Copies of this chain bind each other. A is one copy, B any other.
Amino acid sequence: GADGVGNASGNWHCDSTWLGDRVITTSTRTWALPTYNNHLYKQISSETAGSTNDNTYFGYSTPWGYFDFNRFHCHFSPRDWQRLINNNWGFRPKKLRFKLFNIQVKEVTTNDGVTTIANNLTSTIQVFSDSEYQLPYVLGSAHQGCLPPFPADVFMIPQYGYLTLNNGSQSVGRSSFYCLEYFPSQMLRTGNNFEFSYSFEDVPFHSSYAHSQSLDRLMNPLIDQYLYYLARTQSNPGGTAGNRELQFYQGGPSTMAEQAKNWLPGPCFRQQRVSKTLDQNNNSNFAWTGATKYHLNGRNSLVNPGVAMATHKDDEDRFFPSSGVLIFGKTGATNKTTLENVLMTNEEEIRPTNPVATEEYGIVSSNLQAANTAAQTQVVNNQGALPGMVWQNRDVYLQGPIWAKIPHTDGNFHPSPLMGGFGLKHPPPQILIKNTPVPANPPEVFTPAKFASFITQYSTGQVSVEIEWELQKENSKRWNPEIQYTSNFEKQTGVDFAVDSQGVYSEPRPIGTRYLTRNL
């Protein structure tokens, strides 16, 4: 930064600019940063609370905080989100610009029950972004602490901490320890400000479209194929006795199912089906026991949300995959709630290309039939990738994560975040912030020991983030109208996506991007 105490270090700019094929969404917020761990790095482990072999962990908690803006509703208003999803077949991020400014560091003293807060003008904060991706990257794990959806809210910066390898609650030899004061970081007083600019690597557009066709129906309904299939292994029964014969027909309008096809549905990893009407569910706890989960190094980790698959079948609304959806809270919901409080997203738009998450991929022959032996088949619950598969990624939601970091590995298959958004090798850097320690008066005779005695203080200020988004226009020749995301129209006690009488902003429903349709 440049000037001194009585000069503001940056303006409030929160806006959205729709120009041509791009949109630039700027958002500004006010934040508050406490002092974490009394300026201490501490190791954390599951030893303190026994938990279970699956939940064991080992790691470190740091005094540093961090800035999270990895949810769309940070950058989008409900109206701006509506322009996007109604008018466009896809979008991707292009550029990023981050700013801290108008920094204030307060000192707080407690005497005789009365708490007093005063400006500390000479105290600093430390801020650095990790550009080289050297620290553990905890973004993209869909935690709390992101900038709020509503510009008028004030949010508290979350604490930074990370996990590493472990054996039980202990640490193995490969466990890493990172001191974050071992990086260069800019130190800022009230006149100083912080900024950096970032540029997204090239990624495919998100698909904001739903298919208007299905794989199995891509044919011409009027015309008959020139390819035979095997229709019958017996002669047409007259009610007397079946006689062995091989009969071949041509796929045609009459029978589409038997007709030949070039393509196959996407892969599935199956999951249990749960009903929203309680009396239709089994009486037992199958949530963890009957769960679909993957086994890694003796740990069973639930598969959530998992491979993208349609949530329910054509006519069945009430069923949902046990682990196979994203679930959001309604406003004023605790960390433990019932079905009425949650907001539950479903992917019904991927039914054309994708299996239903709660049902089989297909069925496959298990044996070699003969004259005495009868044909047997087995059900395919899980299927990996086969040549000729097509699928869709999970949808992105106004409340959902924007990106996640692709791990650094020898290989990956079609990397995309299974929660949603844009897989990135070099995602937006983590921004880390801390209150610099201010010692309380030292003893006046030299002792080597650690101080532990500090002035309790916190800092506040504003942060603005600006992302440039690229749009993919809708080319469709469809005659009839599209589906659109609309407002309620009929009267109601309060406006959706607006504050109530008490001042509490709320988002009544999740909103996905897939409305406009295109051919498959």
Contact = CB atoms under 8 A, between A and B. Distances in A.
Given A327-B228, A487-B484, A517-B174, A375 B293 contact: no
A77 to B, nearest CB: 5
Given A295-B361, A302-B257, A173 B40 contact: no
Interface of A, helix, strand, loop or mixed by DSSP: loop
9 contacts: A14-B184, A55-B256, A172-B491, A216-B296, A250-B336, A279-B371, A297-B351, A389-B412, A484-B484
B280 A384 contact: no
Interface in A313-370: 313-315, 322-323, 326-329, 335-339, 341-342, 351-353, 355-356, 358-366, 368-370
Contact of A246 (B57, B278, B301): B278
A173 to B, nearest CB: 4
Interface in A1-60: 1-8, 10-15, 28, 30, 32-45, 49, 51-52, 54-55, 57, 59-60
Contacts of A267: 384-387
Nearest to A516: B174
How often does this chain occur in the complex, in copies?
A: 3
Contacts of A192: 6-8
A221 B216 CA distance: 45
Given A79-B482, A176-B478, A439 B32 contact: yes
A: contact size bracket: 35 or more
A213 B57 contact: no
Contact of A385 (B289, B385, B393, B417): B385
A487 B517 CA distance: 12
Nearest to A152: B181
B388 A413 contact: yes
Contact of A138 (B30, B115, B219, B376): B219
A160 B480 CA distance: 19
A336 B249 contact: yes
A12 B118 CA distance: 25
Given A144-B448, A189-B6, A482 B487 contact: yes
Contacts of A364: 269-271, 292, 381-382
B479 A77 contact: yes
Contacts of A273: 365, 368-369
Interface in A224-256: 224-234, 242, 244-250, 252, 254-256
Contacts of A263: 407, 417-418
A451 B32 CA distance: 9
